């Protein structure tokens, strides 16, 4: 679970950004729903879920969680 | 095929944050239970976009995602 | 010149644009979602963190302190 | 499976077929979920699938026509 | 007027055309394959059996007699 | 460059390979098949027309003479 989502997470996670509740996190081409899987798998208390796009994963953050704190964790995770 | 018939086949769970409705499906159906939810044009839902097993549906305001999120787990 | 290239592409392709909160809600035709998110995304915006792209549907977040309903109407006037 | 069934009874429009291909089709954003019943019905002739948004190509294994897939599912239909 | 505008797309939209045996393979910008792909199915041509997009190739399947190979001829005369 | 690095992924997302005729059918775990698709095609065999990716599934489609069978054979050595 969270032991291969902190793998992809070095090896596929290229920034993280945030807005409100949202962590915006940018991979390589068409590698967001494989990062995105991970990150399901390891079902995250602190994450609602997770929608993947084709290079953009957005990451939706359980209140009182922030997207900024989301994307801290995930950037210090690389 | 509608919205309130397909709630009950497709609808693994529900959830929310802020202005957001979480709505998860089976594997490959979140474009199929999405398509159902822009046809029924809810005056409260202003979008949706679709992954593979998740759906983000947009609150309008001042309607806000828990609102949403309940419509939706009452009517499956 | 991403700029330009969104802008003509938001000519072609953007139905209609509306707004909740922190996020722009932009329609395109079907199967269209894609394209115009990747131009969206190449004009790297300030004002954009970034978009997700669903089949007639593009969500855009916005950076703080602009809002949904300030991105959505400078796309709707780009157009 | 049933479940593979079940869901062709209920998404399947239609069939057709070229080569070693059948080519099914949809309602638009319904080719995933179907499909992914298709995978899990684990079926003999079948090499395997790719869902588009309203269309699924389903390969056909040697000698197995895409002629001869696509009678299988108007039949379960 | 769906024959019509599937050559416009194809003009904008198709940066090379191949084949192999009953397929004819499209390729276009990224995140385009699906719009495009829309057009050829709306345009319901007698020679295409149906088309599949990913994110930049597009797959046609060729309703036989036609082969891949007269199929995206066909094509490449509209780019 | 593209080949290593396709080398790479292969051994990292490739579940198992078949094929049929002039395609070769590539499995991949859950979500992964645009990623490995990518490092396909941004190695630019002469072997390969194109890919399509699915969610779990890639369509590998052949050059002739090239058969399926060839190429899940390559694949398969360099997994
Ligand atoms: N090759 C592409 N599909 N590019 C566009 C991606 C648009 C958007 N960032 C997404 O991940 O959904
Ligand atoms: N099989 C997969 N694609 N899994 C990843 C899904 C990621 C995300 N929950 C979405 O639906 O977009
Ligand atoms: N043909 C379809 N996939 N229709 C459903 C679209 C659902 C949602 N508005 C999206 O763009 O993701
Ligand atoms: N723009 C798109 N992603 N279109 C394809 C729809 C998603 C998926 N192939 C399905 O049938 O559910
Ligand atoms: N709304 C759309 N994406 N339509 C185009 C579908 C193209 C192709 N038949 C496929 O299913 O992949
Ligand atoms: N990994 C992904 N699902 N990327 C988006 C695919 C783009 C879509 N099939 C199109 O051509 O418009
Ligand atoms: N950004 C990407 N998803 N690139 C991979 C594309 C793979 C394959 N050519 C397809 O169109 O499905
Ligand atoms: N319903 C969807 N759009 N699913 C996308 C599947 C993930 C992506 N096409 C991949 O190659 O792994
Ligand atoms: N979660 C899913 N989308 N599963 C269905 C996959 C269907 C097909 N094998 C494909 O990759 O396109």
Do not use: K, W
């Not at 596929?12 to 949202?22: A, E, F, R, W, Y």
């Not at 798998?41 to 997770?50: F, K, S, W, Y």
Request: hydrophobic letters at 45%.
């Amino acid at each position: 679970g969270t032991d291969r989502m902190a793998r992809l997470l070095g090896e596929l996670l290229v920034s993280t950004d945030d807005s409100g509740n949202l962590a915006v996190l940018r991979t390589p081409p068409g590698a967001a729903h494989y990062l995105a899987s991970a990150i399901d798998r390891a079902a995250l208390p602190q994450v609602v879920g997770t929608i993947a796009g084709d290079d953009t994963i957005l990451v939706v953050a359980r209140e009182p969680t922030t997207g900024a704190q989301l994307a801290g964790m995930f950037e210090n995770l690389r």
